[PDB]
Amino acid sequence: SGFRKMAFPSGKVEGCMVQVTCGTTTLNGLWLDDVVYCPRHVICTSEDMLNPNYEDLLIRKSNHNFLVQAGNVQLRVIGHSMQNCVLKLKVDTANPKTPKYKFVRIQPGQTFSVLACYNGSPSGVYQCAMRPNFTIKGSFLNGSCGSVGFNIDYDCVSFCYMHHMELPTGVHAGTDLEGNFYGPFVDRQTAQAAGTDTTITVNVLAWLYAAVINGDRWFLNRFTTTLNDFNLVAMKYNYEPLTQDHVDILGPLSAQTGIAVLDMCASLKELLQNGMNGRTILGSALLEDEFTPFDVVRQCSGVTF
Amino acid sequence: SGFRKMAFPSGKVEGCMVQVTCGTTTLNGLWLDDVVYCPRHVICTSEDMLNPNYEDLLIRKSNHNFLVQAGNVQLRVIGHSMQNCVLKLKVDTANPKTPKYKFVRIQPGQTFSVLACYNGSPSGVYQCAMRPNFTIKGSFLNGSCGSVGFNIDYDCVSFCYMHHMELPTGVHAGTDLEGNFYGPFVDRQTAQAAGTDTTITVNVLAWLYAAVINGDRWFLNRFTTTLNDFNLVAMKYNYEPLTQDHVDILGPLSAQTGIAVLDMCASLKELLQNGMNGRTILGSALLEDEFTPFDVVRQCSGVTFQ
């Protein structure tokens, strides 16, 4: 028993992290097969970052202007190209530690593990969610750009996030590994802000199921509701709408615990309307929304990789 | 910016995890150099879990009664010995993935990463703290025994915990890597219970300093306190006593933020009295006590958001 914010084991990703330096800028790169992926703003000076013309800045660079270091070994760059907001540096050696992997783009509300890195060296690992406002509440300091987020399935690493920037409220923005930003953000030093966020309803419900599985039941009640009635409450409390697909996805947990989703929605309805009355759930005084239904099933059944 | 429960990258430990089987019992082992470490209760049988005589159980085993599997490879056991509550199986192959490592026994309040494993394969990684009552609040299922806790400050893995058991409140108990339990617990299924737990005061103060570093001051006040008056109040909320050692350890965070330690103590006193009035601190509505002063300096900027 027990329930913790749990990240995937990071070893398969650790073996892919390298240091990329261009001019005075050093950040992290991801070395897979014979290509190193990193943020394209590595080629910028501070002057450039105000209003960068990335097409123009890139032609001015040669393969020897990119210094790529895997541990204490320099990698020789033999080509360079841009894909959206990601730079792709072809190197002369395929990474022998390349895991089975694919690039995926995730949806808001989905969770992933972040391997925070500095100077090409992994430093920490933690679990995040893509927020509805397309930010992540990460923990990043200067030099963390190029750190990546991922999920694992059996032996396949699904890379979903590359870190690019911090917004004024202290939350973070980045791209998929094909260089497309999550959210309405750009890689230039202009006025940008996180939009108003909302709470991920289906994940709160998943975590209430985790609580019941771990013996925390005080919030259960005799009542049920309907999707329409509950979604009017969700809107009121800046919760994401609950769809029928969400209900279907929670089906397993409903069957296991004997609490129908709309039954649990009646519990969440009451928690939103009344609060927790001084009590806690799984050690939290807030309604936690960064566990997905899959995360709950995976942790409570001990799936391995 | 930001503040997360941050674990160490687990790869160095993943490369050491193996499966150990004796009889019908399978759990995890830790393969370092030519030795596999695992909980000695792998040699128990179902009928004899209350009062196992481990010396008598072990003398009846040969090396080939232990099946050690590293991924898809069977390792050959060529010797065995018991050290306290850990079994040490000598194998015929040194682990080529052995990191630089050491064994350290930790004190209550210290934190570490756990790599939860089943059948020698990793499931996930998370942060824990050694509670004042010598338990940890982990996430462990059947077969998780032999999973380990560790830190990796400066590219050396310090192993500090090996998982052995779950107590009735759902919390967890285990040993250091020399096999000595944390706390008064024994590897027997006789009735045992964790002591009343308390909050790790020095860690709460560290986390309040982290909040200031990251730009939040709403919880501070104009007051101060003596150390003794603080402890008289904090103990009424089941907080651990704050010692002069703890005050000294908080010095660097006090210096970076300009908030004297006993002034932060006065802030904590008021928070215990008032709650948060609908506010949060670093994304929490409770006072967090599983970040150490060392953890805050590890994760936070050296420059305060003034």
Ligand SMILES: *[C@H](O)[C@H](CC(C)C)NC(=O)[C@H](CC(C)C)NC(=O)[C@H](CC(C)C)NC(=O)OCc1ccccc1
């Ligand atoms: C090993 O994988 C397993 C891990 C647990 C998380 C399940 N450990 C054990 O099975 C362990 C073996 C004994 C010999 C140390 N037993 C326990 O952990 C046991 C609970 C299990 C059966 C779920 N706990 C236990 O016996 O605590 C003592 C006790 C006894 C009676 C009443 C209260 C407490």
Ligand SMILES: [Cl-]
């Ligand atoms: Cl310690």
Ligand code: NA
């Ligand atoms: Na109900």
Ligand code: NA
């Ligand atoms: Na020791």
